[PDB]
Design a protein around this ligand. Structure first.
Ligand SMILES: [Zn+2]
Ligand SMILES: [Zn+2]
Lengths: 103, 62, 287, 96, 126
């Protein structure tokens, strides 16, 4: 029941922050600390990113809120996608290394 | 109550080790040596194999 | 700003036990890999049990619960579809994709007590045969008579719910500490104090070399991060005698499987599932 | 006041205001800033060692993100001074 | 850009413990200016022993010729704080994130310090 994403609800929603420029909040539905922690740690590697963090306010409500603040050089969505792509490439490299080590 | 399986704390299968544990206890083996012979390095599995009480025998007899 | 380049070195590899070292990566990646391999890797296990004869002293629900915990070979877990996702059938008996049928029938016609193990559990698909380790997992013990006949169905599931679809068994990782010795304050210490310092360590992390009459670092991976030697050195009056700090970019992984899948295959499946999760989380650009 | 901090809250506040020897880096400070309503203060600790980068935040500044900027507090017994919503000083006592 | 610069020698340590795992308030007396200083320094991270000599500097900004709010390479114990009390032999009370500093000297030595201003703390042990 909890595994299935709610019907009619998108996994990731984009909401811009009016008070702070170049600030946005990403609400990831049906996510846990696994994705949030690695995304937060990957975002810190980017130089343009200023604020990177995630929170899980309600354990019962399986949602993850990710807040990204960047300089006047890249959009928060661009940094988010870049971090996801870098993490995917790292996973590919780790899989290749493990496959080589097994053989 | 038969020996519990899957070692509630750890998750390791211990269902098929009760007969071996009893056989080791039949010989001149202490509880620690018997548990070590079964390759149980975590004390949760050792507790599960040591704190179990065989109650199914009384259920079958009575 | 870009991706990392982790390095993997395998120390020991077996069917159910794997120990490898992961380097040049953050703690978050290792923790996420551990969590995925302990709670996200799917396996096949019995969830629905139908019985007709239950003359055994044990209750029906107890038998069903202890049947659901039996480890089964899960080589097809990745390819199989979920029961809720399977739309070809509503779910009854054997299915070509989701459900696997199991039949058990035990009748005791002898004075000796009959033990219903996991070996006498037959399935239509040979690939879903329960893992054999021995005498097998004892299900029910039967006296004279007391027949037990049941029909069971096994479905693919995630280890997050009911904690019975988890193939991993306490997968761990450490930071692989590095030991630093001043080697100058040791000369001031007497022979008696060196022995006491050696005995202070809970595990065999430091050794005494008889030829050089000085302490050496042996097996640095078994430190367990217990501040016993540091406290002993501070008590003896030497504050900076031994400095031990964890290494943030080095890790040593220990993966123990339950027999459902191979440990290397478990790691590969965890990596694939993490990649799929990242792909699903990925958000398309909007203009 | 009818409502107090509570056991865990009081103990955590005492620990974060008494130790003063544990510093929080940028990642942990930003992670904790999610629950705090107010913005992050300056690190106030640029360099602690000749070869230590990554300027850190002190524990007392973490507790300072719980007061409005216009709020001003003074507790002479515990030597607590809050100016512009920032906890300037504290010695001991935990009576405040 | 440096307002106050002087050489200090530590007189005593209030905790005076090597492994107390606590902030240690240092007492240093200035040379050629006769100024007394209280400063909370983490001894475990930055070791200071009685009798050591260190230079101390205070600048409103770390940038060169303006840009208030690159001297980082020269020093090794940079701190940031504000001056909240100038009441006196005038003395200054600057808190670096809860770490109190008490610089007591002469009225003429310290006169260009304003109230409620942000100032840095540069310290190098020679
Ligand atoms: Zn265990
Ligand atoms: Zn089906």
């Amino acid at each position: 029941e909890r595994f299935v994403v709610p019907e009619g609800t998108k996994k990731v929603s984009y909401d811009r922050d009016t008070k702070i420029i170049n600030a946005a909040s990403f609400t990831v539905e049906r996510e846990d600390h696994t994705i949030g922690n690695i995304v937060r740690m990957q975002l810190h590697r980017d130089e343009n990113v200023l604020f990177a963090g995630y929170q899980l306010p309600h354990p019962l409500k399986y949602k993850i809120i990710v807040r990204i603040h960047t300089t006047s050089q890249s959009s928060p969505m661009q940094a988010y996608n870049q971090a996801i792509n870098d993490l995917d490439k790292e996973l590919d490299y780790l899989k290749n290394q493990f496959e080589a080590e097994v053989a | 109550m038969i020996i519990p399986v899957r070692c509630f704390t750890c998750g390791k299968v211990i269902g098929n080790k009760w007969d071996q544990y009893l056989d080791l206890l039949q010989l001149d083996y202490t509880e620690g040596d018997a548990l070590d012979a079964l390759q149980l390095v975590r004390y949760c599995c050792r507790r599960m194999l040591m704190t179990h009480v065989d109650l199914i025998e009384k259920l079958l007899n009575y | 700003t870009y991706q990392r380049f982790p390095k993997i070195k395998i120390r020991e590899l077996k069917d159910d036990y794997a120990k490898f070292e992961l380097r040049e990566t953050d703690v978050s990646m290792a923790n996420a890999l551990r969590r995925v391999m302990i709670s996200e890797v799917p396996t096949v296990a019995i969830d629905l049990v139908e019985i007709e004869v239950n003359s055994s002293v044990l209750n029906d629900e107890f038998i069903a619960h202890r049947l659901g915990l039996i480890p089964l070979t899960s080589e097809r877990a990745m390819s199989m579809r979920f029961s809720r996702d399977c739309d070809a059938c509503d779910g009854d008996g054997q299915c070509e994709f989701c459900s696997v049928e199991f039949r058990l029938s035990s009748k005791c016609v002898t004075d000796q007590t009959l033990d219903v193990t996991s070996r006498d559990l037959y399935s239509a698909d040979p690939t879903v045969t329960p893992v054999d380790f021995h005498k097998g997992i004892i299900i029910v013990k039967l006296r004279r008579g007391q027949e037990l006949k049941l029909r069971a169905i096994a479905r693919k599931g995630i280890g997050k719910d009911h904690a019975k679809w988890s193939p991993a068994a306490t997968v761990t990782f450490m930071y692989e500490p590095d030991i630093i010795i001043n080697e100058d304050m040791m000369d001031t210490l007497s022979d008696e104090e060196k022995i006491d310092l050696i005995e202070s360590s809970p595990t065999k992390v430091f050794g005494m070399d008889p030829v050089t009459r000085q302490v050496v670092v042996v097996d640095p991976e078994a430190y367990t991060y217990d501040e016993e030697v540091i406290k002993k050195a501070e008590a003896m009056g030497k504050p900076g005698l031994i400095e031990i700090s964890p290494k943030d970019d080095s890790f040593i992984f220990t993966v123990e499987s339950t027999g459902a899948v191979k440990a290397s295959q478990l790691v590969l499946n965890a990596i694939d599932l993490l990649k799929q999760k990242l792909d699903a989380v990925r958000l398309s650009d909007d203009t | 006041n009818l409502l107090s901090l509570g056991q865990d809250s009081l103990t955590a506040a005492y620990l974060v205001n008494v130790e003063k020897n544990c510093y929080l880096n940028r990642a942990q400070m930003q992670q904790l800033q999610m629950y705090c309503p107010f913005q992050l203060p300056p690190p106030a600790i640029i360099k602690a060692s000749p070869s230590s980068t990554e300027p850190q935040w002190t524990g007392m500044q973490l507790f300072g993100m719980l007061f409005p900027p216009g709020f001003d507090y003074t507790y002479p017994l515990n030597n607590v001074v809050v100016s512009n919503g920032e906890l300037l000083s504290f010695s001991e006592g935990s009576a405040w | 850009i440096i307002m106050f610069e002087d050489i200090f020698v530590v007189d005593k340590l209030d905790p005076d413990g090597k492994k107390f795992d606590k902030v240690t308030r240092v007492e240093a007396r200035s040379h050629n200016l006769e100024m007394f200083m209280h400063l909370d320094v983490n001894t475990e991270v930055y070791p200071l022993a009685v009798g050591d000599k260190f230079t101390l500097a205070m600048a409103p900004t770390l940038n060169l010729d303006g840009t208030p709010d690159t001297l980082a390479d020269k020093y090794e114990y940079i701190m940031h704080g504000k001056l909240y009390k100038i009441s006196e032999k005038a003395e200054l009370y600057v808190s670096f994130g809860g770490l109190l500093m008490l610089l007591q000297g002469d009225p003429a030595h310290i006169s260009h310090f304003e109230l409620d201003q942000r100032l840095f703390l540069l310290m190098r042990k020679l």
